[PDB]
Amino acid sequence: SGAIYVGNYRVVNRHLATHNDWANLVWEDSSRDLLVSSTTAQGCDTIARCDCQTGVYYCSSRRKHYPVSFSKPSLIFVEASEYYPARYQSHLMLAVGHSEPGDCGGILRCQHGVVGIVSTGGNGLVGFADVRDLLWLDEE
Ligand SMILES: CC(CO)(CO)NC(=O)Nc1ccccc1
Ligand SMILES: CC(CO)(CO)NC(=O)Nc1ccccc1
Ligand SMILES: [Zn+2]
């Protein structure tokens, strides 16, 4: 579980979006496993605006923060999961680390701010859904 709170936007994993997120939808992309909804109150998370390939993510399944190197956002083949069919996930960054399904929503951060949220795991890899390209999260 977990989300990013920036301006009046709530960014979650699409496969974990609630009634209210769908009721208050702004943007979703199944291929990115992302959904942005609107929020009453204002958030304090800054979205990174950078091409950093080093960061730190929270792994709920280890109650541990791990420093990691991660590939640039790419179109990656992701083996089928409970919520998804085996498909090409877009804007996905891969690191070596531990990730189980419940690790989704775990934030990846660099010095510039929030880079992504855990979206994929398996075979000692962790996959993060990039949000740095969503320049529109910083305004309105
Ligand atoms: C507080 C908590 C649990 O530790 C959410 O329950 N998450 C974090 O602190 N995530 C984090 C990720 C990368 C860098 C810094 C922080
Ligand atoms: C190594 C580096 C430096 O930017 C990646 O570029 N990571 C961070 O600075 N992580 C960080 C996480 C939470 C709070 C503050 C910093
Ligand atoms: Zn950065």
Amino acid at 83: Y
CA distance 89 to 93: 10
CA distance 126 to 39: 29
Q: Is the dihedral of CA 4, 114, 135, 31 positive or negative?
A: negative
Token readout for 78 is 């992701």
Catalytic-role residue among 21, 33, 103, 130: 33
- 83-86: long-range contacts at Cβ-Cβ below 8 A with a sequence spacing of 24 or more? 83/15, 84/15, 84/33
Instruction: Identify which of 33, 58, 75 has the alpha carbon closest to the alpha carbon of residue 109.
Output: 58
CA distance 9 to 43: 8
Nearest CA to ligand 1 atom 13: 57
**Does 50 contact ligand 2 (Cβ within 6 A)?**
no
Distance 110 CA to ligand 3 centre (A): 5
Q: Annotated binding residue at 110?
A: yes
**Does 65 contact ligand 1 (Cβ within 6 A)?**
yes
CA distance 96 to 112: 22
Is 92:119 a contact under the CB 8 Å cutoff?
yes
**Burial letters 46-79, b for 16+ CB under 10 A, else e:** ebbeeebeebebbbbeeeeebebebeebeebebe
- 33 flagged as catalytic: yes
**Does 109 contact ligand 2 (Cβ within 6 A)?**
yes
CA distance 115 to 79: 23
